[PDB]
Amino acid sequence: AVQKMTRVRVVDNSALGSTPYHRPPRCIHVYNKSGVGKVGDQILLAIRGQKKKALIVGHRMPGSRMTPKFDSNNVVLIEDNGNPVGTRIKIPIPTSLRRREGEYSKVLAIAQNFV
Amino acid sequence: KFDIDMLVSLLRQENARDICVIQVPPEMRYTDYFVIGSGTSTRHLHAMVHYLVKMYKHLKCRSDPYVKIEGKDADDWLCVDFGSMVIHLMLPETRETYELEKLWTLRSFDDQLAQIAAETLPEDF
Amino acid sequence: LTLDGIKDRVLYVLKLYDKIDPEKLSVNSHFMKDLGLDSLDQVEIIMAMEDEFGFEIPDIDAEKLMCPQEIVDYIADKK
Amino acid sequence: TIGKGFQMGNQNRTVYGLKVWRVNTKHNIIYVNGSVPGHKNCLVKIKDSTLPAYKDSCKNLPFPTYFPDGDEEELPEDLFDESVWQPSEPSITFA
Amino acid sequence: APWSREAVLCLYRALLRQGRELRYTDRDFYFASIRREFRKNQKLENLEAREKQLEKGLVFLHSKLGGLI
Amino acid sequence: RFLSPEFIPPRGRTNPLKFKIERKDMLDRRKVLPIPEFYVGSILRVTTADPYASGKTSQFLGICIKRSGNGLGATFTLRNTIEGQGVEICFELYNPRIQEIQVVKLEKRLDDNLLYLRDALPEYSTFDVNMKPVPQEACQEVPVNKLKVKMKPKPWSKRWERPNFNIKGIRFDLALTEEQMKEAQKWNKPWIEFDMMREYDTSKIEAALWEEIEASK
RNA sequence: UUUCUCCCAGUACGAAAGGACAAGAGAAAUAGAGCCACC
């Protein structure tokens, strides 16, 4: 449940995300009709004093049965053109994104680890 | 029916410069086949992407629904997700930069995987 | 086995590879000095020969051959 | 509806479009999709769906009613819908 | 440099054989990529590092070309 | 005689007939799929059919941390750390899409709930997914792990120090002083240990259930 | 209750460019009336 605020971890090799910064990246909205952000929901993440779109891949909110509950909030950066900002993803990514409605093939291709 | 062998032949028919297909063993819980395609120019990328979908719709797939085309707006990366195979179409130069082939061929041994780094996010006070 | 066939065929497989320049592809064409071949070059050149004749050639003595006629002899005496 | 006291409730309400999944003949138990207003052990009224789509569904059902007295063909104790996965069936594999 | 150059030779040939046995991929690109891979890495390496490179390729060799299909 | 928790019905006004019918269906499914005996703290490997994948099964290994639900809707959760990420998956016992259930290591832990392991060190929660089954004795009690886990800094998900939780597997002394325990003990509610209004007797019910389960076999 | 996507269909139409209907399906959102198998 990526609600307002909700400090998050940038799982990407993008220069902004990869470079350490003293302020954590924050998520204070979601690209959805509802205000709550879950796995597969686009967001906009303020990183290194810049705003970049990111895709949620994990959350710490309890999930439905038969699904794994993550302990950290993980996101993947996506460019305006639609291609991922980063060329690789480190943290395991759930495979449910494929069937989820939306364009997730590009992100999944960049995901090395699947759980 | 529309299967891997038909699509790859169709990709060759439209003169795909670079094609990479990676099979997935039953142990790995993802699509059976992952496909990466090169195309000389964005015009070529649009043409090849349209050709595969048109053949797919004609070639039975009645049980499967119609497949939308993703990434047509991008001039360097178009990806179409079919029922049993996913084709990622890009320019030749874009191919090396992303190295999608390395990711699937080396599931955990890809060099670019190491390129990812970590960070520290302490509070101000 | 035909020694002449091996000699010409060994030359043919050497000729097949494009990277090496057959400026002087004689039966006594040396690799390190005559053709200026790197370690990888002799690594791959032997493999092209192995494909034609069914491999079984190990590099323990193949890299010491240093010329088409010597590999021809090694092929001839192992056949 | 369940009464909530002074603040409510205790008023008749209707839920529409509930599918029937299975019926138990021995105990006369009907399995109805979704939730039903009211508390447990509360009497409810059951009648055919009045939605426009299901205008004429009784044509293939007992028109007046089902008569066990006739006993033209003894019905199974448990009736299942085709999509319903019956217990004791093989484990479902998404092949 | 290598612990045994014999493995390097067999490794290069086997990669070529699988390329000719690889249908769905574009054989042209695979041959070029393998040639580049040999040139980039094998020119300079350490004995311990070189052992990993040849050893991993041997598993790559013995594992249906490491999933390339 | 190990009576599985789901068979025991919960108190309420629901008709007992539902449990009898539910148990019959549960017993029939048990014949199709064998449900091994396990307890919280045991490491299990469960085989399930993958909906996203086509004709490919999934096996997840983790220590059992919680058992919940009754009847056909009973579920169990097992926890593990994969790629350094703690993950908990809830599996429904009678779901048709669970192909097989394997108890890799049958054992018990100090507490009936292991949610505090999230606050414990990662090593106590890390388990090898590929670990082979360990020998077990059928006609014996499951091994009880008495190791006390070490906690992370004071901020925790729950106040395990409070007497109500009554966690017996936490090294509170290392992370909490005796004075801090006394503050936690302020919520003792000692009458609760002696309160007969929160006690539910299922001795007769448990005994009756045993014959019914065995009879179906 | 409202919205979006898909489908119909790159079809009708149009020299091309471009580009529909209606009918059907899936997703959500909110409102209303309820419900506790699971969380």
> In b/e form, how buried is each residue of D24-47, taking b as 16+ CB within 10 angstroms?
eeeeeeeeeeeeeeeeeeeeeeee
Strand G, nucleotides covered by protein (CB < 7 Å): 5-8, 10, 27-30, 33-39
Q: Can you name the residues that pair with D29 across neighbouring β-strands?
A: D24
3-state secondary structure at position F78? strand
Of B5, B21, B25, the CB nearest to E25: B21
Fill in the amino acid letter for A60: R
* A19, two tokens: 């470079």
Half-sphere exposure of D37 toward its Cβ, with a 13 Å CA cutoff? 12
CB of F117 within 8 A of CB of F79?
yes
CB of A91 within 8 A of CB of A74?
yes
Direct distance between the N- and C-terminal alpha carbons of chain D, in angstroms, rounded to an integer = 44
Fill in the amino acid letter for D74: E
CB of B69 within 8 A of CB of B80?
yes
- Report the run of H or E that residue E18 belongs to, with start and end: helix E5-20
H, E, C per residue of D58-84: HHHCCCCCCCCCCCCCCCCCEEECCCC
D54 burial level (CB within 10 Å; 0-12, 13-18, 19+): exposed
d(CA B26, CA B21): 16
Name every residue whose Cβ is closer than 8 Å to that of residue F52 and which is 6 or more positions away in sequence.
A95, A96, A98, A99, B29, B30
**Residue B104's closest chain A neighbor by CA?**
A112
Count of domains observed in chain C: 1
d(CA D38, CA D44): 8
Fill in the amino acid letter for B39: G
- For this PDB entry, the determination method is cryo-EM
F144-145 vs F108-109, strand pairing mode: parallel
d(CA E17, CA E36): 17
* F147, two tokens: 């190791």
Options C4, C34, C38, C61, the catalytic residue: C38
Of A65, A67, A71, the CB nearest to F86: A71
Rounded to the nearest angstrom, the gap between the alpha carbon of residue F44 and the centroid of all alpha carbons in its chain is 11
In Å, what resolution does this model reach?
Answer: 5.7
Fill in the amino acid letter for F117: L
Selection from B49, C51, B100, A89 nearest residue E29 by Cα = B100
d(CA F160, CA F162): 5
d(CA B61, CA B56): 7
Q: Sheet of A9-10: strands edge to edge?
A: A9-10, A74-78, A50-58, A42-47
B43 burial level (CB within 10 Å; 0-12, 13-18, 19+): exposed
Rounded to the nearest angstrom, the gap between the alpha carbon of residue F129 and the centroid of all alpha carbons in its chain is 19
State the helix-helix crossing angle for E5-20 and E27-42, rounded to 10 degrees. 160
Name every residue whose Cβ is closer than 8 Å to that of residue D45 and which is 6 or more positions away in sequence.
none
CB contact under 8 A, A114 and B28: yes
Q: Which of B4, B17, B22, B35 to mutate to test the interface with E (most CBs of E within 10 A)?
A: B22
CB of F8 within 8 A of CB of F217?
no
Rounded to the nearest angstrom, the gap between the alpha carbon of residue C4 and the centroid of all alpha carbons in its chain is 14
Query: Is residue B76 left, alpha or beta, with left meaning phi > 0 and alpha meaning psi from -120 to 50?
Result: alpha
d(CA F136, CA F145): 14
D79 touches strand G (CB under 7 A): no
Q: Sheet of B19-23: strands edge to edge?
A: B19-23, B33-38, B85-90, B77-81, B69-70
CB of A76 within 8 A of CB of A97?
no
Residue F127 CB: number of other CB atoms within 10 A? Answer: 19
Q: Closest nt to B50 (CA→C1')?
A: G10
Domain region containing C30: 1-79
- Report the run of H or E that residue B82 belongs to, with start and end: none
CB contact under 8 A, F97 and D93: yes
Name every residue whose Cβ is closer than 8 Å to that of residue F81 and which is 6 or more positions away in sequence.
F87, F122, F125, F126, F127
Residue D12 CB: number of other CB atoms within 10 A? Answer: 8
> In b/e form, how buried is each residue of F164-195, taking b as 16+ CB within 10 angstroms?
ebebebbebeebbeeeeeeebeeeeeeeeeee
Rounded to the nearest angstrom, the gap between the alpha carbon of residue A27 and the centroid of all alpha carbons in its chain is 10
Fill in the amino acid letter for D67: F
3-state secondary structure at position D18? coil
Residue F198 CB: number of other CB atoms within 10 A? Answer: 7
d(CA B41, CA E52): 39
Chains D and F touch (3+ CB pairs under 8 A): yes
The percent helix, strand, coil of chain B (3-state, each to 5) is 35, 20, 45
Alpha-carbon separation of residue A53 from A6, A16, A85, B85, F184 (angstroms)? 16, 12, 9, 27, 45
d(CA B66, CA B71): 16
Alpha-carbon separation of residue F113 from D7, F76, F77, F126, F198 (angstroms)? 40, 11, 10, 17, 19
Name every residue whose Cβ is closer than 8 Å to that of residue D54 and which is 6 or more positions away in sequence.
D48
- Report the run of H or E that residue B32 belongs to, with start and end: none
Half-sphere exposure of F211 toward its Cβ, with a 13 Å CA cutoff? 4
Residue A45 DSSP code = E
* B58, two tokens: 């004609």
